[PDB]
């Protein structure tokens, strides 16, 4: 199974300023994942371009599962992201009606 470290859209320890530079002028559905500001292992933050803004979505992690809200149903961050490449986040929040379309790639 592909690891999070090897995902093209996972940038690790980068700042919001760096994220905002990468998302400037990008279309809706542009996205990346970075480590959460808490700097706690297993805590990550999805940044999604929508409406010219950079929306921050916490990735929750409990009991070996991940997700945006309870119930947490995904076995990895990679599985969570790949799911929303093909389903809108509108289910999580009506203001996030886009799929994850355009990864910001580190490769």
């Amino acid at each position: 199974p592909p690891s999070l470290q090897d995902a093209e859209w996972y940038w690790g320890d980068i700042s919001r300023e760096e994220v905002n530079e990468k998302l400037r002028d990008t279309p809706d559905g542009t996205f990346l994942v970075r480590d959460a500001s808490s700097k706690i292992q297993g805590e990550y933050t999805l940044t999604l371009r929508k409406g010219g803004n950079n929306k921050l979505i916490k990735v929750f992690h409990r009991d070996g599962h991940y997700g945006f809200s309870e119930p947490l149903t995904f076995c990895s961050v990679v599985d969570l992201i790949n799911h929303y490449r093909h389903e809108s986040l509108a289910q999580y929040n009506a203001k996030l009606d886009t799929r994850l379309l355009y990864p910001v790639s580190k490769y």
Binding site: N54, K55, L56, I57, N93, L96
Partner: peptide, 5 residues
């Protein structure tokens, strides 16, 4: 902050 619930 700019976190979406």
């Amino acid at each position: 902050d700019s976190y979406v619930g």
